[PDB]
Design a protein around this ligand. Sequence first.
Ligand SMILES: O=C(O)COc1c(C(=O)O)sc(-c2cccc(NC3CCCCC3)c2)c1Br
Length: 297
Amino acid sequence: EMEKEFEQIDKSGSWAAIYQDIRHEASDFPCRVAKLPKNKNRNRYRDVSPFDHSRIKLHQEDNDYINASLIKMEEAQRSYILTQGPLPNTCGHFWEMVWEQKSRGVVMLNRVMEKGSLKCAQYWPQKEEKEMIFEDTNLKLTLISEDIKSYYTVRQLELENLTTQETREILHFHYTTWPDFGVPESPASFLNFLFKVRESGSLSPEHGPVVVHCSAGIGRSGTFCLADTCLLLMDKRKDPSSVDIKKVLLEMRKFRMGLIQTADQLRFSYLAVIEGAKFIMGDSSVQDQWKELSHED
Ligand SMILES: O=C(O)COc1c(C(=O)O)sc(-c2cccc(NC3CCCCC3)c2)c1Br
């Protein structure tokens, strides 16, 4: 039971060993396609690659490779696509993936520049009057509107398949204050953001899997997905005790390596789930409380 385990591990200050045990037991599968010579410039980090069995394949004959993984949580019945921050040459691929996979939401947990480096390409239009055209994948992207909060921004985008002229609305949830290798300011600010993704309908099973990214697509992205999945499992059975967080994280790691980068991110996952459990089990005041405590205004 998480809350008891959390107090136990915090009392004995052994989050490092607990987290390290996860790394020791994590699945290991081949990433041969990602390591092919021709795909070197399609990877942001040499040591972060998608496993071949769960990698997202672009629908093209030339080169179907993108650094992205389909995290399919069978029991929870929710899927996520975790990918890297798009590179200057893979933004077309990124949106091609969004289109072909029928995703409605894109969750971005990093800033373009962090600690003096470029963690992610500017893959979306910043101004209405300057849409973006991706010639290689033949797609057009237009900023329709944006709602800027104190620590996150929600943008409404229009993605067009130039080949068929079909258009789709994509919601972009940009979390802008989550430090790399760090944790959110509080469970409240994190949950307020998650509940805003959730309330947009972006996670509905009627849409394709939501796309989640940071820089490498495993640390902050891993924390976000673990918390969401655990809350959903808890929700489906209306029983917080039935959720084994570490077991869920190990399950997720069968689809993409490295999920959750630090022991404190793991510890934060517990905090978020435990707090979120209040809403799941029918507390109608916490959502407004989180909103208040997050100071999004
Ligand atoms: O999102 C965050 O909090 C931090 O994000 C990041 C990075 C960043 O934002 O710069 S780099 C990085 C990384 C790059 C190469 C190898 C490994 N580490 C290996 C550890 C063993 C398993 C395979 C990955 C981790 C991670 Br994650």
